[PDB]
């Protein structure tokens, strides 16, 4: 109804646009803490992309008049067009920036 | 006269040959009858703590026992309740003659 | 054709039979319709207020059609549900026996359900024909 293309196409491009490409890992080894950046497999990219979209709409539907249906729709549409208001897009920015700083 | 041979036991092998002997005595002479009906086994289960005292990790048990019930349906006049009544009883299994 | 009560969806038929029970209220209206809670598990009386008695009668009669014999306890168990016993967990609670009794006797007065052998009730011969005639109507209303 909104953003009149094929919704299946919208779903697939959203997950390909919110899947992190670089990520940090634990390497504390021996000495309090320390991060270190690594890469993300394509399978983990899809898994992380789906998880971020689901948790973002679920949290945004917590104690809110908007139902989970429109919250999921708004989250997927906004992530599809790569806008900053998406929870998943913002989370992808955080992980990539953290990995970039600890490169 | 609707003689029915009811057999209950805990040993399947001993109950099987008793039915086999009863059914083999049935298929001799004429004795048109109904074969062994296989009732579901009644499995008793009493679950109890292994510990006689209260100390110890929670480890329960299950003492089970299976009852196999099969009935044999006969149909003939008195000329076989002089003959079927000769019980082929082994230790364990029991017989209860019921007419009509 | 060969349509019957089994050739219809539940929601449409019960509403249709409720529709063809409110327009002429021949069956009965008990005096305590507006004060019952339908069970000891339900916390609030039904919000249908004006009706809800022919709605239950429609559901009961349709339930009778597909079965042979039932009882008031059987209706209580079917129409019951879980009860919120405070902080204690939920538990199944039977419905109000008087409500199903009044409905069942009311269906006897009109001539839709009568007593059957081996105990219990059973759909009536006049009951079967009118209930089937309802199915022939509700399908063609949408047509």
């Amino acid at each position: 109804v909104l953003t009149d293309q094929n919704p299946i196409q919208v779903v697939v491009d959203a997950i390909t646009n919110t899947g992190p490409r670089e990520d940090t890992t634990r390497v504390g080894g021996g000495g309090a803490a320390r991060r270190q950046a690594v890469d993300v497999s394509p399978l983990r990219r899809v898994n992380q992309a789906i998880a971020l979209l689901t948790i973002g709409a679920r949290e945004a539907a917590f104690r809110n008049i908007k139902t989970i249906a429109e919250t999921l729709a708004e989250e997927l549409i906004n992530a599809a067009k790569g806008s900053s208001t998406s929870y998943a897009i913002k989370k992808k920015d955080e992980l990539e920036r953290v990995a970039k700083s600890n490169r | 006269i609707k003689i029915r041979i009811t057999l209950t036991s805990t040993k399947v092998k001993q109950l099987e040959n008793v039915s086999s002997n009863i059914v083999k005595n049935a298929e001799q002479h004429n004795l048109v009858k109904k074969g062994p009906v296989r009732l579901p086994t009644k499995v008793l289960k009493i679950s109890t703590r292994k510990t006689p005292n209260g100390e110890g990790s929670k480890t329960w048990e299950t003492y089970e026992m299976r009852i196999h019930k099969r009935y044999i349906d006969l149909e003939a006049p008195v000329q076989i309740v002089k003959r079927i009544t000769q019980i082929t009883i082994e230790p364990g299994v029991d017989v209860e003659v019921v007419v009509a | 054709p060969g349509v019957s009560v089994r050739d219809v969806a539940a929601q449409d038929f019960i509403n249709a039979y409720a529709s063809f029970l409110q327009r002429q209220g021949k069956l009965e209206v008990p005096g305590y319709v507006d004060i019952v809670k339908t069970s000891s598990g339900n916390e609030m009386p039904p919000q249908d207020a004006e009706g809800w008695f022919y709605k239950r009668a429609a559901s009961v009669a349709r339930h009778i059609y597909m079965r042979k014999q039932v009882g008031v306890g059987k209706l209580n168990k079917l129409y019951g549900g879980a009860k919120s016993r405070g902080v204690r967990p939920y538990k199944h609670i039977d419905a109000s026996g008087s409500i199903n009794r009044k409905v069942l006797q009311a269906l006897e007065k009109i001539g839709i359900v009568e007593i059957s052998p081996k105990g219990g009730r059973r759909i009536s011969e006049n009951g079967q024909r009118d209930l089937d005639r309802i199915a022939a109507q509700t399908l063609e209303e949408d047509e």
Binding site: - | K58, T59, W60 | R6, D7, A9, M66
Partner: protein, 141 residues
């Protein structure tokens, strides 16, 4: 002696027997038409065997299915498996392999669950927890 076949099907604990005889195209479950499911979402899941290959093979058969056991989805999975095996059984007592073999290939080409039942069954509960793998909350101090 009128043409007829019979099958069976299970999902977790349900059973569904399809007495597929020779008829004018009647698909009924518990005396109700196929279009009256209950989840109203898996209606197309039980519509499956109707629509993978086409309705032309369904025009000379009547599938009557009786179901008992399991949840609403389990009943649905019982119905779809029974009618799918009912279709092949009707093709496995009258009609040729080309009708049957590409029928019985295409059904599994989409999903193996149409003919092959789900092998997984509930596992027994072990003492010390609410389930088999699950255990009660243990603590120290």
């Amino acid at each position: 002696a009128v043409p007829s076949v019979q099958t069976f099907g299970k999902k977790k604990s349900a059973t569904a027997v399809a007495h597929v005889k020779a008829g004018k195209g009647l698909i009924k479950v518990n005396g109700s038409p196929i279009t009256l499911v209950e989840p109203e979402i898996l209606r197309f899941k039980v519509y499956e065997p109707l629509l993978l290959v086409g309705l032309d093979k369904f025009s000379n058969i009547d599938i009557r299915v009786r179901v008992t056991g399991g949840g609403h989805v389990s009943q649905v999975y019982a119905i779809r498996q029974a009618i799918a095996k009912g279709l092949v059984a009707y093709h496995q007592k009258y009609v040729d392999e080309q009708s049957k073999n590409e029928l019985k290939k295409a059904f599994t080409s989409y999903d193996r669950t149409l003919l092959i039942a789900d092998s997984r069954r509930p596992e027994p509960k072990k003492f010390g927890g609410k389930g088999a793998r699950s255990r009660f909350q243990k603590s120290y101090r």
